[PDB]
Design a protein around this ligand. Structure first.
Ligand code: ANP
Ligand code: ANP
Ligand code: ADP
Ligand code: MG
Ligand code: MG
Ligand code: MG
Lengths: 484, 66, 51, 167, 467, 466
């Protein structure tokens, strides 16, 4: 049924036997420890141990499972917290895992799919206007440590309350959250954050951390994928967040090096691209003939001193359908969430907004990449013609708009509200140092007064000359009532 | 599946002579007690050190200011 | 508090309780030479079934 | 060029590469057995108190070590087409290796003959048959005639288990 | 004959053969799979064993599994019945439409068009994209390359290329997505069925699709491009036809080659590419060519790893081109799409004796003034603008105009831009710039040239921005 | 049983057991020297040989030489009979005060606190150090990291913290010196006997000392980080107590790793480090934590090689902290002590809901003007102050004061500063800056804010000059 252990060290067990073992097939150990075959060589199987290899000793017994590696799936996982193999670890006794999907699934080819059309809202003004995500998209969050990379992915799940506590069965989005490499002290503090704001209910949270074995971080984001593959392959909407792929890669490197696979750039192994490529392809927008179901994926990357030449950060950017950059510089400068518009792209553009947003911000992304350059050219105090005197006279106010609090998403309707304020030029005459006490009022004033207008735009997701007309006064009915 | 359903019975011919043998946790030796005191300290920690059988009185405090 | 002063108690005891099982069964086979007959028994019922 | 009699034991992949040779060098003249015993003998012509002052001696070298192995071949019960697996290890500087080369000669011989599965507690079943676990029963008849999370893990822990009846 | 797997790591499987040692390149057959697995032979380690790359994932194989010497190199559905059909690495169709039906098959490992077959005729293929045509026109039936770091508009360009060039074309086109995004294939299929260069009904399909994306193994990606070109190599040699071969992204070929190289036994070379990055490219670019027998206009897009145009991959690619459009992040970042570097882009036919002294003299004049503006660039922005000559505030003025008039609302980019597509005929481009250059619009303000089509459409925005 | 040394190199030794074979992690015991030479199995090479990391010099060992299995990990004294005693990496005592008679023992290795045991208790821990408090406050029972290159003042800062913190602290403190200066230990010892945290007379001692310094072999430096670890662990668990764990220098742990990884036979990773830098660390690291049971406030000094904050060592470690203080040579060279980078030190509790949005507001307001100054930094260097717009001429002057008012003369380097050691309470910290920020002080010279306590000593100073 299976055989010997030739030698063991560093999570790498050589095995003399297992002669009919499948490559990539998981073995089991004497001590009851699940391992894994990865090197099928002439005279031995190198096996990556999925845990503390102290228990293993030369000579122990390794037995086949026959199975390629797999994990628990389905709604029976929501609200839980499972390790990289599906096992529960929040102390609430096993999950109801009737559904059991394989980790090593290849991604949907060409036909099973359809252009990404479905707005995946983050509730972050910055993202939802200038780099909008859509269901099936891979949008990378990349940045130096402590820039806000996570308070993105968290603020987004916490936004999905609104839709998951309602009726409309398309607007619903179940969330997985892989946590690779982090410290338990944090994974936890984070679940606590989810729980509080009440979002934990619609959210798997697979967690393979610091102390967890190496192959367990290697695998974690895959497992957490299969779990999200179900939700799409069965006509529902998933948003998985790998946080972060940087730490995962490092892990894969360890296995690979210990397995004696000759090292490449920065020591990583050759396929270190394939690793993130394949995983990240598995997020798609399935076409109707297949469920209509989706899997939006926010991978996360962490840079050193901003170096986006680093082997990895360049790989993952080449893979995802765009990205948000972070930048500590903007952060302290006041631009929280620190984003760098001009350098953030969404390779799906408006094809993933409401026609409500699109109308307030569809050519303002190529405007805050020219008002940018046209305030960096005439930085100095001189003179400039009739055309470029205004662009600046505007922007400064506009940016004060995407300045946003934390753990406080916004529903698309309200976003369109404030964005309208400026973009149509109803702020083009206000001192920026106030454009926040302003918004914080004009938006609680037009929720207490006109649940009316929101009603329409929220639903039909557009601003008819009707809706627009009402606005055109509700606004005006405010600037003159403060300054003038 | 027919020479194994009764070997799982060598496990309640003892489970029996245990959950009936009163007179103290069986054959303990010293160990049994000491440890049941260390975990009697730390479990007496997160909560406090006062009387757990009585209803606590109440000292109250004014509202500070920043 | 007592939700816990009884929690460590029902478990710990039931540790020594199910563990006590071990040492009385290692005494049952090591001793009882008539528990070396119930050895060759159940085991020869292996070769068979498998085939 | 020559085709090779790879006998379904195969063994190595890197080192006892001479061994995998003579199941193919032998299987032409069917002198498999002539050597199966020839080697057994040389395995101790070298473990003498008179042969270790070269066995592991980079002192004499490929000079008087190969033509001083025209003796421990020609002389004794050898001098066939197997006095050469020595005359190779002699030149190719791996006399210090032959024990392992004989070892594997066996484990490849007794897979054209015997089978190797072993009992639990003592010796070799040598089930030299056309069928595995056929004669595994009818040859061990000459052997007579000569549940709460934790208790789960602690029951399989004695069955086929541990340090007990192992001794 | 029959062979047995001896060992398996990641993407490299060694196999042992009783008798029939398959020649390097020979496609081998893995017996026992729920989906076909081929192993292109790669070397003879000896002792009747051969190391090989898998054209799909080796999850599942087992030491001893049955392998059969398919006797010859991978072979594909070359032929006319490939149009409208999505092929792949090994021929197998994957639009779900049951076997591709032809009785002509060719190995994807050919030799290369000898010296004497080389065609020396080059004539200007206009693309209607102003920047390319003005400063670096492509040539009918020539090797074109699209250089780009990630996200700078490489792929979008090649779309607006297949939209323009490949629609008003009555020949055959072969687009092969090597190693990039699967999303983007599905994305094109449907645009290319809306336009119906692919028609599901009749047989009027003008476009063969070969595909092997970033979700497949290194084996696949390493050879997907070898396939898609075998496909377009037929339509050339036979028809005598005008085959348009697009690749995206010819980079993934050398990268893919990289991933396995390690496991194949290679001391790595500089930047850690295969010691063979050079020739691997050679005996493969040297096939994507134009013989006397036929012509292939080729439009490759090359990833520049981290934008370093010196990275041994994009670097070695330059030798193999006749016209190179190089994309700039710094330009894109300024909103000037298509971010073509008007000073790193080059054509072989930018010769006054080929494009005329008007064209040439005008391109080079634009190139010059942009270069001069680049020169004043760190005087001015740190030491007071108006401290410039009269001559210079002038060559700045015009330059920034020229520099913006070089942008174009692309038709496949309306989704991003916000303006309706566009397309300018060569002579209205030459004229447009010749003018700006000549000092005829020094009065109209900057933004008027930003993202318009023919020069007049800027005089349009010239008043629209006014009153 | 018994086996023999068959290979020795550096701190890596290869033992052959014919009978039996020790689990990976079993402390072996060399038989033949006047000095307890523990080996520690780390690999089974097969052919019934194991590979081990020494815990001391290996001069002398011979191919031959017997070794006895201990049947267990390296195990050391734990309990209250450690407080006041200096012990080495294997538990042996080294304060020449007899043995450490103690009830129980623990092993140095140990699995780490399961997810259920974590605690999200976030309460601020004031240091009385202006920069730390105002911009990135330490958290009670939190992990704290002090990053610095050679000589920027980690050790001083850890000392000041030990003083402003562990002196008036009802609760046990453990200090692990990992591969730093032996004379720093001698220095601590005496300094803590005088001050009386250690008492030779009683068992009133409040601190345990574990030391394995930069003179001991890789193995020893490799491990000792864990010895002291285990100790703190006990005081947390079997005492549900308030533990203070100070390490200096946690870097030397990964470094020592590197020295051995070479001959253990791993293939080198980035920058030459061990393949296993992230987990080797992360196991060890995740044991240092506050659980439901006990509570450890950890403070680890982290060396940064060649000032490279991206070197894997410092680089990886960041993941593991809740508050970080980063020291820049750049700053220190301008006599701004403590050398804290205000735009690079962070805490996972700078959050209005936790520190009260007056704190969070004065913070990010300082953090802003500073990072605004920092942007002008380039034009000021090439064209000079004058080319600065009027608005900007200010943003500098104010910022430059903030820059200067974050300096604070520590009660330790009363010797280098000469100046009297101040400790500033959160209130007057938050206040003073607020004022500086609202420009009450644009009338005072820069120096006036350099090296002072509350904002009074500032305005006060400004006079003595005039
Ligand atoms: N929009 C915001 N406004 C104000 N503060 C914010 C905002 N977003 C994030 N923060 C704060 O900035 C810190 C960093 O956020 P975080 O999401 O952990 O970035 P990060 O790069 O993922 N950190 P890390 O996981 O160590 O890499 C937090 O502790 C927040 O409270
Ligand atoms: N906080 C301080 N205030 C004033 N002067 C200081 C301060 N810290 C360090 N210095 C001076 O600079 C030196 C370095 O102090 P130290 O804390 O030992 O740096 P370090 O982080 O330990 N680098 P090293 O101990 O060599 O690994 C001192 O000996 C002082 O003369
Ligand atoms: N023709 C264009 N006009 C305006 N923006 C463009 C244009 N082409 C590309 N972009 C911008 O650049 C982004 C990336 O384009 P893409 O061609 O996919 O990069 P890559 O070169 O790696 O394939 C787009 O999503 C878009 O926002
Ligand atoms: Mg994060
Ligand atoms: Mg692309
Ligand atoms: Mg120090």
């Amino acid at each position: 049924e299976t055989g010997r252990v030739l030698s063991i060290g560093d999570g790498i067990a050589r095995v003399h036997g297992l002669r009919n073992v499948q490559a990539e097939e998981m073995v089991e150990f004497s001590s009851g420890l699940k391992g894994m075959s990865l090197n099928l060589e002439p005279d031995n199987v190198g096996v990556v141990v999925f845990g503390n290899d102290k228990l293993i000793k030369e000579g122990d017994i390794v037995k086949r499972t026959g199975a390629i590696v797999d994990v628990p799936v389905g709604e029976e996982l929501l609200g839980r917290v499972v390790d990289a193999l599906g096992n529960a670890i929040d102390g609430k006794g096993p999950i109801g895992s009737k559904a059991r999907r394989r980790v090593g699934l290849k991604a949907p080819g060409i036909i099973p799919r359809i252009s990404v059309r479905e707005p995946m809202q983050t509730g972050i003004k910055a993202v939802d206007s200038l780099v909008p995500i859509g269901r099936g998209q891979r949008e990378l969050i990349i940045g130096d440590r402590q820039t806000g990379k996570t308070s993105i992915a968290i603020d987004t799940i916490i936004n999905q309350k609104r839709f998951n506590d309602g009726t409309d069965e398309k607007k619903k989005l179940y969330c997985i959250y892989v946590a690779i490499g982090q410290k338990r002290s944090t994974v936890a503090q984070l679940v606590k954050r989810l729980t509080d704001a009440d979002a934990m209910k619609y959210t798997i949270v697979v967690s393979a951390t610091a102390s967890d074995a190496a192959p367990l971080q290697y695998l974690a984001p895959y497992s957490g994928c299969s779990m999200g593959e179900y939700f799409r392959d069965n006509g529902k909407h998933a948003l998985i967040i790998y946080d972060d792929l940087s730490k995962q890669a490092v892990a894969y490197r360890q296995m690979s090096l210990l397995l004696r696979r000759p090292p490449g750039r920065e020591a990583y192994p050759g396929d270190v691209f394939y690793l993130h490529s394949r995983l990240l392809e598995r997020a798609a927008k399935m076409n109707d003939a297949f469920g209509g179901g989706s899997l939006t994926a926010l991978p996360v990357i962490e840079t050193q001193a901003g170096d986006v030449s680093a082997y990895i950060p360049t790989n993952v950017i080449s893979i995802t359908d765009g990205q948000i950059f972070l930048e500590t510089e903007l952060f302290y400068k006041g631009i929280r969430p620190a984003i760098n518009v001009g350098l953030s792209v969404s390779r799906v553009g408006s094809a993933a907004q409401t026609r409500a947003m699109k109308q307030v911000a569809g050519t303002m992304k190529l405007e805050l990449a020219q008002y940018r350059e046209v305030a960096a050219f005439a930085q100095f105090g001189s003179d400039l013609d009739a055309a470029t005197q205004q662009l600046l006279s505007r922007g400064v106010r506009l940016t004060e708009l995407l300045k946003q609090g934390q753990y406080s998403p916004m529903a698309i309707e309200e976003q369109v509200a404030v964005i309208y304020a400026g973009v149509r030029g109803y702020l083009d005459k206000l001192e920026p140092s106030k454009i926040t006490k302003f918004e914080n009022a004009f938006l609680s004033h037009v929720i207490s007064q006109h649940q009316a207008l929101l009603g329409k735009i929220r639903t039909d997701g557009k601003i008819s000359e009707e809706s627009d007309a009402k606005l055109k006064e509700i606004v005006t009915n405010f600037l003159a009532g403060f300054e003038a | 599946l027919d020479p194994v359903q009764k070997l799982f019975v060598d496990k309640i011919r003892e489970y029996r002579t245990k959950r009936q043998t009163s007179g103290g946790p069986v054959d303990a030796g010293p160990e049994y007690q000491q440890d049941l005191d260390r975990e009697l300290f730390k479990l007496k920690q997160m909560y406090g050190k006062a009387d757990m059988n009585t209803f606590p009185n109440f000292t109250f405090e004014d509202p500070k200011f920043e | 508090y007592h939700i816990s002063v009884q929690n460590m108690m029902r478990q710990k005891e039931q540790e020594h309780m199910i563990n006590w099982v071990e040492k009385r069964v290692v005494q049952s086979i090591s001793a009882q030479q008539e528990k070396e007959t119930i050895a060759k028994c159940i085991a020869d019922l292996k070769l068979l079934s498998k085939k | 060029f020559a085709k090779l009699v790879r006998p379904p034991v195969q063994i190595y992949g890197i080192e006892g590469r001479y061994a995998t040779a003579l199941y193919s060098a032998a299987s032409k003249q069917n002198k498999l057995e002539q050597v199966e015993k020839e080697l057994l003998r040389v395995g101790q012509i070298l473990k003498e108190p008179k042969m270790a002052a070269s066995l592991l001696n980079p002192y004499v070298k490929r000079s008087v070590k190969v033509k001083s192995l025209s003796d421990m071949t020609a002389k004794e019960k050898f001098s066939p087409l197997t006095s050469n697996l020595i005359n190779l290890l002699a030149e190719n500087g791996r006399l210090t290796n032959t024990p392992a080369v004989i070892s594997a000669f066996s484990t490849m011989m007794s897979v054209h003959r015997g089978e190797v599965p072993c009992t639990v507690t003592t010796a070799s079943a040598l089930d030299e048959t056309t069928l595995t676990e056929l004669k595994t029963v009818l040859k061990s008849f000459l052997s007579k005639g000569q549940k709460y999370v934790d208790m789960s893990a602690k029951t399989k822990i004695q069955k086929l288990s541990r340090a007990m009846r192992e001794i | 004959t029959t062979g047995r797997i001896v060992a398996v790591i990641g993407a490299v499987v060694d196999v042992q053969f009783d008798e029939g040692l398959p020649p390097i390149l020979n496609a081998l057959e893995v017996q026992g799979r729920e989906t076909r697995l081929v192993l292109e032979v790669a070397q003879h380690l000896g002792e009747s064993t051969v190391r090989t790359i898998a054209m799909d994932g080796t999850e599942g194989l087992v030491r001893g599994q049955k392998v059969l010497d398919s006797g010859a190199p991978i072979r594909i559905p070359v032929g006319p019945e490939t149009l409208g059909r999505i092929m792949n690495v090994i021929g197998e169709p994957i639009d779900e439409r049951g076997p591709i039906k032809t009785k002509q098959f060719a190995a994807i490992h050919a030799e290369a068009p000898e010296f004497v077959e080389m065609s020396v005729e080059q004539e200007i293929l206009v693309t209607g994209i102003k920047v390319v045509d003005l400063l670096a026109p492509y040539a009918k039936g020539g090797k074109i390359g699209l250089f780009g770091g990630a996200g700078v508009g490489k792929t979008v360009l090649i779309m607006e290329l297949i939209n323009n060039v490949a629609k008003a074309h009555g020949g055959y086109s072969v687009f092969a997505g090597v190693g990039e995004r699967t999303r983007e294939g599905n994305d094109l299929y449907h645009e290319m069925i809306e336009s119906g260069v692919i028609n599901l009904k009749d047989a009027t399909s003008k476009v063969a699709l070969v595909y092997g994306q970033m979700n497949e193994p290194p084996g696949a990606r390493a050879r997907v491009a070898l396939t898609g070109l075998t496909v377009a190599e037929y339509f050339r040699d036979q028809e005598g036809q005008d085959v348009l071969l697009f690749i995206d992204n010819i980079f993934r070929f050398t990268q893919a080659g990289s991933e396995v190289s390690a496991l194949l036994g290679r001391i790595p070379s500089a930047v850690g590419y295969q010691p063979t990055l050079a020739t691997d490219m050679g005996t493969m670019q040297e096939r994507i060519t134009t013989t006397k027998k036929g012509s292939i206009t080729s439009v490759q897009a090359i990833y520049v790893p981290a934008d370093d145009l010196t990275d041994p991959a994009p670097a070695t690619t330059f030798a193999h081109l006749d016209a190179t459009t190089v994309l700039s992040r710094a330009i894109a970042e300024l909103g000037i799409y298509p971010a073509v570097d008007p000073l790193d882009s080059t054509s072989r036919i930018m010769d006054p004796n080929i494009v005329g002294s008007e064209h040439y003299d005008v391109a080079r004049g634009v190139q010059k003034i942009l270069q001069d503006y680049k020169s004043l660039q760190d005087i001015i922005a740190i030491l007071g603008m108006d401290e410039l000559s009269e001559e210079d505030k002038l060559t700045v003025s015009r330059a920034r105009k020229i520099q913006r008039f070089l942008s174009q609302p692309f038709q496949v980019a309306e989704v991003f831009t916000g303006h309706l597509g566009k397309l300018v005929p060569l002579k209205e481009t030459i004229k447009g710039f010749q003018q700006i250059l000549a000092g005829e619009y020094d009065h109209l303000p900057e933004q008027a040239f930003y993202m318009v089509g023919p020069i007049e459409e800027a005089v349009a925005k010239a008043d629209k921005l006014a009153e």
